[PDB]
Design a protein around this ligand. Structure first.
Ligand SMILES: CCn1c2c(c(=O)[nH]c1=O)[C@H](c1ccc(C)cc1)C1=C(CN(CC3CCN(Cc4ccc([N+](=O)[O-])cc4)CC3)C1=O)N2
Ligand code: NA
Length: 124
């Protein structure tokens, strides 16, 4: 079975709008979302439908760009650091669960290279 997916809204979580967060949504997420390698990462990992039965025995902090996209669009975050941490978690899960040189790890590295490309231009 799959665990419950990460929340994308919470009536008890304080939130802000900042230029850094606008940048993360409009530049970083939108650029990675359209990438030809984005598709494994655009929704929570369905370990049943994808035939990764051990996935959630290993990965205890799931994250994906579909969740991140909705958190940004819903204004879930307080600061840019929280959003970067979610991206970092997504990539980490891929590198931890899969083995070095796995095709999916090669995909994640290309997306991560682009992610860092855009973060290097994050505004003040
Ligand atoms: C980030 C999580 N994640 C992932 C995977 C993983 O390995 N590790 C992870 O962490 C898996 C993975 C993703 C990409 C690549 C290049 C290799 C493996 C993996 C995903 C998504 N998905 C969808 C399909 C599954 C069906 N198809 C074979 C296939 C084709 C056609 C037919 N038909 O025509 O009928 C039948 C069967 C291969 C891909 C995966 O396979 N996510
Ligand atoms: Na911020």
């Amino acid at each position: 079975m799959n665990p419950p997916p990460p929340e994308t809204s919470n009536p008890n979580k304080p939130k802000r709008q900042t230029n850094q967060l606008q940048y993360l949504l409009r530049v970083v997420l939108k650029t990675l979302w359209k990438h030809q390698f984005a598709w494994p990462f655009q929704q929570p990992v369905d370990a049943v439908k994808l035939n990764l039965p051990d996935y959630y025995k290993i990965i205890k902090t799931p994250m994906d760009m579909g969740t991140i996209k909705k958190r940004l669009e819903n204004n879930y975050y307080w600061n840019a650091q929280e959003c970067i941490q979610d991206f970092n978690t997504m990539f980490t899960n891929c590198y931890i669960y899969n083995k070095p040189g796995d095709d999916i790890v090669l995909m994640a590295e290309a997306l991560e290279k682009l992610f860092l490309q855009k973060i290097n231009e994050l505004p003040t």
